Amino acid sequence: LPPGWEKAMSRSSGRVYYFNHITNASQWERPSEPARVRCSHLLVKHSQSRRPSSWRQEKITRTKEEALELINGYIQKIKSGEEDFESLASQFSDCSSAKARGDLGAFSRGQMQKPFEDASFALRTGEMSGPVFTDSGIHIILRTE
């Protein structure tokens, strides 16, 4: 299996699924290094973020647990097709990249927070992560290039 991918069994149905312990992605389907990647992200900050503030809210006070519930709700809406990643990043991301539908542009190793970097490079083009935790808060990351 590609880097970071492992086999598990669903608790509710018993069926085999695959999850990635670098990107926190999980999916039923069996899965399948560049100098640079391009990603977008949606960040939900919480009270222990390095800076607990954003363009959305001057004082961010939600707990880490409440941030993670939000992130999980947005992942659900994205995977169901109810909402697009870009539309939710523009409305809800706690980072000024929201004004570019979450786009960060292209970057190499050695530039972003390390868990964000590792998740970004472990995604294939087009793939989306699960919740990815960094000092800034919790991200959903979409690799676009």
Span 1-31: which CATH code?
2.20.70.10
Contact status, residue 96 vs residue 104, Cβ threshold 8 Å = no
The catalytically annotated residue of 26, 47, 90, 113 is 113
Q: Residue 142 has which token pair? A: 């979409």
Shortest CA distance to 70 belongs to which of 102, 51, 94? Answer: 94
Fold of 36-145: Chitinase A; domain 3 (3.10.50)
- Residue 141 pairs in a beta bridge with 41
Q: Is 113 a catalytic residue?
A: yes
Backbone dihedral angles phi then psi of residue 6, each to the nearest 5 degrees: -140, 160
The catalytically annotated residue of 46, 95, 97, 120 is 95
Contact status, residue 4 vs residue 21, Cβ threshold 8 Å = yes
Instruction: Give the H/E segment covering residue 41.
Output: strand 36-44
Amino acid 103 reads: D
Q: Is 21 a catalytic residue?
A: no
Q: In what order do the strands lie in the sheet with 5-9?
A: 5-9, 16-20, 26-27
**What's this structure's resolution in Å?**
1.7
Measured CA to CA, the distance from residue 107 to residue 52 in angstroms comes to 25
Q: Is 39 a catalytic residue?
A: no
Contact status, residue 121 vs residue 109, Cβ threshold 8 Å = yes
Answer yes or no: same fold for 1-31 and 36-145: no
Angle between helices 64-80 and 85-92 (to 10 degrees): 150
The CA angle 111-78-36, to the nearest 5 degrees, is 25
Secondary structure of 10-23 as H, E, C letters: CCCCCCEEEEECCC
Map out the domains of the chain as residue ranges: 1-31, 36-145
Q: Residue 132 has which token pair? A: 């990815």
Structure-solving method: X-ray
